[PDB]
Write a protein that binds this ligand. Structure first.
Ligand code: MG
Ligand code: MG
Ligand code: MG
Ligand code: MG
Ligand code: MG
Lengths: 141, 313, 227, 78, 77, 142, 103
RNA sequence: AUUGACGGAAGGGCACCACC
RNA sequence: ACGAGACUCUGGCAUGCUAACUAGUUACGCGACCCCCGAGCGGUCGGCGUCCCCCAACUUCUUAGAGGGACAAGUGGCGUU
C-alpha cells in the first residue's frame, strides 16, 4: 500500500516536486488542475507528457506537484520535468523495467529536457558594466 | 562435437559488466553487476527476439558495482561497490535491507558462506573483514594480511576444513582458516597481480589468475601445486563448472575452457568480427558464470553486453 | 544579559579588537622583536600571548613592563580587573618570520649601517635559517634625492595562486630617516615539513612525489608453506 | 585547450617507468593505482596524470615511445 | 638520556623553583642553571636530568606552555 | 464536488462580484467614485462597480493563504509606478480601500479576525465561495 | 534533566567540525540522546570597496568577504554532565553558547 | 661588433577594450 | 626556476552516507467546506496536532559537511600515426 515515489525537476531556480502514488488518473499542481496553470499560452508544454504517453499510462496513478522558486516559465518547465521523471521512476520501481524503457525512449526521443535538467544558471555581474559580459560605454577625447 | 555457440546477447547496460551471478533455485533469472552503478535482475525469456529482458534494476551504490552474489535460497543478493559499502538486497521488493559500512576504501569483492550465516569481503585498503547477516563487522584480519589490495575472496563449499581463499595484487594466494581467522597456507607462485580466485564445486581444487596470463591450480587439502595453464592475455575472471570437469577463463577478448583431465583447450570462444578497421582492441570479457544445470555460460563484456554461450553435443 | 549583539557585529568587533591590539603592540614593542599576538579565551582569565624574539625586555624589569601593558590593555578595552593576563613567548625560529626580520632590518637601518650590507646580512640569515627563498625590497631615497628601489632575491619565490597564502609570509615596514622615509618589504618562502611547526604541512599542489618501488625479486617455480 | 602540461607528462612518465607492471589500459584502475603510489595533492591533477598514463599505455603496446625506458627492452631479442 | 632543555626562563627563577616544579613528577638527579658569568641570574636556559628517561618523557608534554612567571616556557629534549 | 481552486479564477472573481452586488448587504464608502486605488495609478477605475470586484478578489485571496492584513493586502494589490523621467519602482496599494473592503466583508459575516493577527475566512465564507465556484464550474460545462 | 542546546559558531569549517566531533563522541560515550549537528545557513558578510586610495584608475573593485558557520547540538541530560562533556580543548576560532532550556 | 628603441621597411601570430 | 597551468572560491550532479520543531515531506487523527441516491483509502486546506517523548516514520524537496564524479576517458576520421 506504500506504492509512492517523490521525484523532482528543476529549471533555473525553480524546483517542482511531483509525488506519484497509486490512484485513479488525477494530476494536480499546487492543488489546481493541470489545465488551469496560469501561463495558458504555454499550456501544451504542461500537457506534453500526457499527450505523448497517452492516458492509460497515467490512469493508474495519482500525481500531485508542488512547485516553488523561479518565474512562471521556469515553473512550468519544472512541472513538465517533474511529472515525466515521476512517472518514469514509478514505472521503474513498481511495474517493470521494459515499460520504463519504452516510456523513457518516447519522452527522450521527443525532448531530452523531460528527464535531464538544464544546467544553465545566471552569471555573476562584474564591476565594469551593467551585467555579466556587457561593459559601460567608453569615451575618447 | 561438444563445442559451444553464441545463443544471443543481453543488452541494457551502460558500463562494463564486472560480475554475473546465478542460483540453482531460479533457473530463469541471473544477476549482472556493472559500472553504470546499477545491478540488473534479468528474466530469461528464451525467444527469437531477445534471449533476456531487464526485469528489475537496483540503484543503491554511488560508484561502480564490483561484485554481486545470490544467496542459497535465491532471495537475498549481496553486492559490493567502489564507494566502500556492501548492500544486502531483497530481490522481491528490489530494495536493500542492510548496508555494511565498515570498509574505508573500494570493495573489490564479496562472498557468501554455503549456509549464508557469515559473509566476507575484500577491498583496496588491504584488509579482509568478516561480517554477519545482521550488519556488524565481526572480525577484521590485519596480521600477515596482503601487502597490497585484495581482489577476490571466496569461501569453500565443503564441510571439512571450512576455509577462506583469497588473492591480491601482491602476487600471493592466502588460505585462511575460518574457525580462528588465522592464516594457514601461503602460496607464492604467481608473477603478476591476481584478479580472481575460484574454488571447485567438489571442494578439492582452487584456481588463480591475473596479469601474467597464466592460471595456477592449487590443492586445498595439502596446499600443493598441481600444474599451471597458460592463457593468451590477462585473466580477468575464472569460473569452474558444476556438472563437468572444466575450468573456464576470460583471457583478454576470448574465453578459454581448459579441461582438467587431458589438460587441453576444448574450445576458445571468440566474439564475431566487428570494427573491421584494425585501429582498436576488441572488448574484453570481464566475468563468467555457469548455470546450475551447466548448459549455459554467461559472459560479461566491455561493450556493455552480456553474451550467452550454449554448449552443444 | 542586557547586552546582546548579532553574530555579524560580534565577529567583526572581535576582529577589530584583535587588529587594534596588534597595532598597539606593534607600535609599543617594535624594538623588542614583536612578531604577533594570539588571544586565548579561558573560563577564569583572558590570556594575551605575545610572540617576541627578545621576550625579556617585553617582560621588562622584574615584570614591570608586562604589568604596565596589562594595565593599559585592561583600561582601554574595558575588561574586568584581574581578568586579563599577558604572557610572552619566544618565537621558535626567527629566520622564518618576515615581521621579525623586517623589524631587524629596520633597526639595523636606524643605527648607522649601509643599506646594502644590512639587506645582504638579513638575506643571508634568512637563507641560512632554512628558507627556500627570500626577497627583500628597500625603496626610498637611497642614493641622493631621486628615489629608487633595490631588491635582493635568493632562491624560490612563488607569487600567484592560493599557495602564496600559506607558503609565503610578508611584512611591510617604514624607517623614518633624516632625509625621508624608507619602505622595507620582506617576504620569505617557508620550507615544506610534514607534522612540523617550521612551515606548512600540505605540499605544493603541483609537486608530485612518486614513492620508490620496493625491490621485487621474482619467483621461479611455485612454492607454498604450510604454517 | 586540452594540452597537458610538463608536470602531468613528466609525472606520468616517471609513474610508468617505475610501475609499468601495475597499469593497464583502464582509466579508473590507473587512477586508483596512481592515487596509491604517488602523493598527488589534488584530484584534478590525479585525473589528468591518470589520463595521460592511460593514453601512454595505449602506445606502449604499439612500440617503444621516445622518452620511456622500461624492462620491455629486454624482451626485444629480435 | 633524560635530556630536558627548559627555555624562556625568568630572572627570578633559581634552582629551587625548577626543583619544586618538576618534583610532582618524581625525583631529580642534576639541575643545571645556565647562570650569567660574574652576574647572578639565568641566561634563559636550563638543563635537567630527571634520573629516569620515562617520567621526563611524561613531563615534557606536561609543563609545556603553562605561562610560568608571565613567560610561556618551551621544554624540549 | 467543486472548490475554488478547481475553476478559472478570473471568471470566479466576476461571478463572486456579481453575487456580492446582487445581495445588497455589502457596505460601500461614500468616496468610491472619487479615489484612485493606489498612489501609482493615473485615473480612477474604469468600472463603476469596482468595489464589489475588489471585495470578491480579496475574498478569494483570503480563501487561499488566509491570515492576512491591510499591509499584505496592499502588497498584493500594489503594482509599478512610473516616476516621469526617473525609473519605475514597485509601490503598494492604498490602505483605506483595503481596510474598508475587509471591514465590509467582516460585516457580511464572511471574514473574521484571526487569532495570531490578521483576517481569515469564516465557515460561511468558505461555504459561499465554494457554492459560487460550483456555479461557475457548472455554467462552464454547457 | 533539561533540554540543553549548545550553539557553536566559527569562521572556519575544519576546527568547527572537529570540535563538533569531539562533543558528539564524548556525549555518545556517556549514553546521551544526542540530536546531532544541525547546520544553519552560513552567513556571508560582503564588503565591496574601491581598490584605489585616491580616485584615479580603471575603476576596479575589491570584494572582501567573511563566512560565518553555525552548528547546533541538543543534549537531554543533567547540567553537571554537560559541564564535563564540554571543557575539552576548544579550538581558538570556535565560540560556544550553552542555552539551558531557558534564556 | 653587441644589446635596446625606432623605420611614413619586409614577413608571421593574437584580441568583439579590433574587424567581419 | 618565476609567470601560464596547477591552486582557492563559485555553478551544475548524487532517491548513495551524516543528520535536523530555528527546514520540511509523507502517513495518521481532529476540524471546516463542497458534491451524494446513503455515497468515498473522494477533493481543497501555508487549518490544528503527533516535542508531555512515542501517543508516526523519514530526509525526496531545504540546509551543509565528508567523500564520489570528467580524464579528451570510449568509438570513428585527420595529423609526421
Ligand atoms: Mg541584465
Ligand atoms: Mg607557478
Ligand atoms: Mg593561475
Ligand atoms: Mg501586484
Ligand atoms: Mg560592426
Amino acid at each position: 500500500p506504500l506504492q509512492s515515489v517523490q521525484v523532482f525537476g528543476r529549471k533555473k531556480t525553480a524546483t517542482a516536486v511531483a509525488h506519484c502514488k497509486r490512484g485513479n488518473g488525477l494530476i494536480k499542481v499546487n492543488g489546481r488542475p493541470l489545465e488551469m496553470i496560469e501561463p495558458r499560452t504555454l499550456q501544451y508544454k504542461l500537457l506534453e507528457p500526457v499527450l505523448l504517453l497517452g492516458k492509460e499510462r497515467f490512469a493508474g496513478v495519482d500525481i500531485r506537484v508542488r512547485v516553488k522558486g523561479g518565474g512562471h516559465v521556469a515553473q512550468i518547465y519544472a512541472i513538465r520535468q517533474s511529472i515525466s521523471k515521476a512517472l518514469v521512476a514509478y514505472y521503474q520501481k513498481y511495474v517493470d523495467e521494459a515499460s520504463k524503457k519504452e516510456i523513457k525512449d518516447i519522452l527522450i526521443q521527443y525532448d531530452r529536457t523531460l528527464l535531464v535538467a538544464d544546467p544553465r544558471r545566471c552569471e555573476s555581474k562584474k564591476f565594469g558594466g551593467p551585467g555579466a559580459r556587457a561593459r559601460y560605454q567608453k569615451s575618447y577625447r | 562435437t561438444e563445442q559451444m555457440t553464441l545463443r544471443g546477447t543481453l543488452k541494457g547496460h551502460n558500463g562494463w559488466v564486472t560480475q554475473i551471478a546465478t542460483t540453482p533455485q531460479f533457473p530463469d533469472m541471473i544477476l549482472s553487476a556493472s559500472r553504470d552503478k546499477t545491478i540488473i535482475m534479468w528474466k530469461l525469456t528464451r525467444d527469437e527476439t531477445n534471449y533476456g529482458i531487464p526485469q528489475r534494476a537496483l540503484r543503491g551504490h554511488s560508484h561502480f558495482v564490483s561484485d554481486v552474489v545470490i544467496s542459497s535460497d535465491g532471495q537475498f543478493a549481496l553486492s559490493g561497490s567502489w564507494d566502500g559499502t556492501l548492500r544486502l538486497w531483497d530481490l522481491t521488493t528490489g530494495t536493500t535491507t542492510r548496508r555494511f559500512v565498515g570498509h574505508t576504501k573500494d570493495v573489490l569483492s564479496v562472498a557468501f558462506s554455503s549456509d549464508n550465516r557469515q559473509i566476507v569481503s575484500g577491498s583496496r585498503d588491504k584488509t579482509i573483514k568478516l561480517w554477519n547477516t545482521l550488519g556488524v563487522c565481526k572480525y577484521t584480519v590485519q596480521d600477515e594480511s596482503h601487502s597490497e589490495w585484495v581482489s577476490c575472496v571466496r569461501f569453500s563449499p565443503n564441510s571439512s576444513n571450512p576455509i577462506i581463499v583469497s588473492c591480491g595484487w601482491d602476487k600471493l594466494v592466502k588460505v585462511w582458516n575460518l574457525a580462528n581467522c588465522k592464516l594457514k597456507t601461503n602460496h607464492i607462485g604467481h608473477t603478476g597481480y591476481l584478479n580472481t580466485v575460484t574454488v571447485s564445486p567438489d571442494g578439492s581444487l582452487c584456481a588463480s589468475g591475473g596479469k601474467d596470463g597464466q592460471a595456477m591450480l592449487w590443492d586445498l587439502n595439502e596446499g600443493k601445486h598441481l600444474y599451471t595453464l597458460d592463457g593468451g592475455d590477462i585473466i580477468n575472471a575464472l569460473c569452474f563448472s558444476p556438472n563437468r570437469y572444466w575450468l573456464c577463463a576470460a583471457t583478454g577478448p576470448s574465453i578459454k575452457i581448459w579441461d582438467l583431465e587431458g589438460k587441453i583447450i576444448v574450445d576458445e570462444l571468440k566474439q564475431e568480427v566487428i570494427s573491421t578497421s584494425s585501429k582498436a582492441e576488441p572488448p574484453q570479457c570481464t566475468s563468467l558464470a555457469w548455470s546450475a544445470d551447466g548448459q549455459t555460460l554467461f559472459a560479461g563484456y566491455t561493450d556493455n553486453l552480456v553474451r550467452v554461450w550454449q554448449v552443444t553435443i | 544579559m542586557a547586552v546582546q549583539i548579532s553574530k555579524k557585529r560580534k565577529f567583526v568587533a572581535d576582529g577589530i579588537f584583535k587588529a587594534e591590539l596588534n597595532e598597539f603592540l606593534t607600535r609599543e614593542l617594535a624594538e623588542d622583536g614583536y612578531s604577533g599576538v594570539e588571544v586565548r579565551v579561558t573560563p577564569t582569565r583572558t590570556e594575551i600571548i605575545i610572540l617576541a624574539t627578545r621576550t625579556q625586555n617585553v617582560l621588562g624589569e622584574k615584570g614591570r613592563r608586562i604589568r604596565e601593558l596589562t594595565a593599559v590593555v585592561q583600561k582601554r578595552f574595558g575588561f574586568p580587573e584581574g581578568s586579563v593576563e599577558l604572557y610572552a613567548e619566544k618565537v621558535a625560529t626567527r629566520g622564518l618570520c618576515a615581521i621579525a626580520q623586517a623589524e631587524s632590518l629596520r633597526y639595523k637601518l636606524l643605527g648607522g649601517l649601509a643599506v646594502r650590507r644590512a639587506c645582504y646580512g638579513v638575506l643571508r640569515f634568512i637563507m641560512e635559517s632554512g628558507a627556500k627563498g627570500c626577497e627583500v625590497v628597500v625603496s626610498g631615497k637611497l642614493r641622493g634625492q631621486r628615489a629608487k628601489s633595490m631588491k635582493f632575491v635568493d632562491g624560490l619565490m612563488i607569487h600567484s595562486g592560493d599557495p602564496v597564502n600559506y607558503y609565503v609570509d610578508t611584512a611591510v615596514r617604514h624607517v623614518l630617516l633624516r632625509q625621508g622615509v624608507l619602505g622595507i618589504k620582506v617576504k620569505i618562502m617557508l620550507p615544506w615539513d610534514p607534522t612540523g611547526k617550521i612551515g606548512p604541512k600540505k605540499p605544493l599542489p603541483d609537486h608530485v612525489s612518486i614513492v620508490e618501488p620496493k625491490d621485487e625479486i621474482l619467483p621461479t617455480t611455485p612454492i607454498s608453506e604450510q604454517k | 585547450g586540452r594540452v597537458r602540461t610538463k608536470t602531468v607528462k613528466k609525472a606520468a612518465r616517471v609513474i610508468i617507468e617505475k610501475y609499468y607492471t601495475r597499469l593497464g589500459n583502464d582509466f579508473h584502475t590507473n587512477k586508483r593505482v596512481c592515487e596509491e603510489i604517488a602523493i598527488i595533492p589534488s584530484k584534478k591533477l590525479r585525473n589528468k596524470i591518470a589520463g595521460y598514463v592511460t593514453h601512454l599505455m595505449k602506445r606502449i603496446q604499439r612500440g617503444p615511445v621516445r622518452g620511456i625506458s622500461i624492462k620491455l627492452q629486454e624482451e626485444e631479442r629480435e | 638520556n633524560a635530556t630536558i632543555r627548559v627555555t624562556n626562563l625568568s630572572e627570578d627563577t633559581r634552582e629551587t623553583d625548577l626543583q619544586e616544579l618538576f618534583r610532582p613528577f618524581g625525583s631529580i638527579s642534576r639541575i643545571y642553571l645556565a647562570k650569567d658569568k660574574t652576574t647572578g641570574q639565568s641566561k634563559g636556559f636550563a638543563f635537567i636530568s630527571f634520573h629516569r628517561r620515562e617520567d621526563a618523557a611524561r613531563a615534557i608534554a606536561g609543563v609545556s606552555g603553562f605561562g610560568y612567571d608571565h613567560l610561556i616556557l618551551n621544554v624540549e629534549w | 464536488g467543486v472548490t475554488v481552486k478547481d475553476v478559472n479564477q478570473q471568471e470566479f472573481v466576476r461571478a463572486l462580484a456579481a453575487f456580492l452586488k446582487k445581495s445588497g448587504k455589502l457596505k460601500v464608502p461614500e468616496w468610491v467614485d472619487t479615489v484612485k486605488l493606489a498612489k501609482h495609478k493615473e485615473l480612477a477605475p474604469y468600472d463603476e462597480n469596482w468595489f464589489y470586484t475588489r471585495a470578491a478578489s480579496t475574498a478569494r485571496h483570503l480563501y487561499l493563504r488566509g491570515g492576512a492584513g491591510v499591509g499584505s493586502m496592499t502588497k498584493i494589490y500594489g503594482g509599478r509606478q512610473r516616476n516621469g523621467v526617473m525609473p519605475s519602482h514597485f509601490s503598494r496599494g492604498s490602505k483605506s480601500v483595503a481596510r474598508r473592503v475587509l471591514q465590509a466583508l467582516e460585516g457580511l459575516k464572511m471574514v473574521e479576525k484571526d487569532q495570531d493577527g490578521g483576517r481569515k475566512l469564516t465557515p460561511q465564507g468558505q461555504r459561499d465561495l465554494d457554492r459560487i465556484a460550483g456555479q461557475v464550474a457548472a455554467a462552464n460545462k454547457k | 534533566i533539561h533540554r540543553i542546546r549548545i550553539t557553536l559558531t566559527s569562521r572556519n569549517v575544519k576546527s568547527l567540525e572537529k570540535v563538533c566531533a569531539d562533543l558528539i563522541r564524548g556525549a555518545k560515550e556517556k549514553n546521551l540522546k544526542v540530536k546531532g549537528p544541525v547546520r544553519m545557513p552560513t552567513k556571508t558578510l560582503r564588503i565591496t570597496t574601491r581598490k584605489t586610495p585616491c580616485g584615479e584608475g580603471s575603476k576596479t573593485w575589491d570584494r572582501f568577504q567573511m563566512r560565518i558557520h553555525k552548528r547546533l547540538i541538543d543534549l537531554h541530560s543533567p547540567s553537571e554532565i554537560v559541564k564535563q562533556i564540554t571543557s575539552i580543548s576548544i579550538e581558538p576560532g570556535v565560540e560556544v553558547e550553552v542555552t539551558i532550556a531557558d534564556a
